[PDB]
Amino acid sequence: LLANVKIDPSLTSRISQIDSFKLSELMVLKTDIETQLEAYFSVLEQQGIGMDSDVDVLQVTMIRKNVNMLKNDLNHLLQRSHVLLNQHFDNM
């Protein structure tokens, strides 16, 4: 019965730009993605169901799918943030 989730403005737009962002933008993005996931996890706590009636199942099904897509994106964010990070210390 959640309604308290914080919402991620311009996220799906910013997410699709990971490969083209600069490091500072990635830092703000990473923090924002995590803020979103914190909200999703608070909810997974309230049902007491981990990531592993019929309107229950449907929401939980979606909640999970959302986190996974967010995790797959945040993962990409770090893989790219890492490469950009490595370029900084080879630059030097």
Next chain:
Amino acid sequence: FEVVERPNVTYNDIGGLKKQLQELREAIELPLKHPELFEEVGIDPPKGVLLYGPPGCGKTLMAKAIAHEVNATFIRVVGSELVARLVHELFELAKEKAPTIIFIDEIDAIGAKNRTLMQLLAEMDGFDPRGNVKVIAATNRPDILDPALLRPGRFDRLIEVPLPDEFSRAQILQIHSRKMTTDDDINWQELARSTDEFNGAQLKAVTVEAGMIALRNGQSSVKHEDFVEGISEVQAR
């Protein structure tokens, strides 16, 4: 599915996992580099090797490093994202771009105990060993798999790929710190203790978190304190 012509990942990029990785090379690298020897003595190499273990422990890493050291094409499939036409098409491409290492991730999602499953059994009976296409599968639950997959001539070679032990963790942190200037007084062993029960993925994410803080501080390298804040930061996730 993801195809990589030739992945640029050496064994040098894999922290720990020495015993397992050698087991893998005995099962895939050897019959590839010298298939005749397996015919001379007359024994078939394993067509498929199953890598089971927790996530972010380097199952993909191992399969890419083999594909690298053996100069092969790396073709990866995600098991959940398959949930039969596509399996045939896969192996077809795999034969076409030989040498090829087929990496089936989340195999349990399609191989629990249907159409797509049966297809995979067919495709592996199809191509013969000593051939230059080898299959590697990755899963969490080898218990949950249908016993047809583990029968001989398929995934008949099993390798546990567990979390990094205290020391393996040190390597993994250093490994992701190589391309990154690092102070000489950095205590890699204390870091390994504070990252109890960490995985490879998380340990990489620590190095990403550390180098960020060093950058935010305009340091010319990453200090030991940065890492610990990194571990601190990573812990909350």
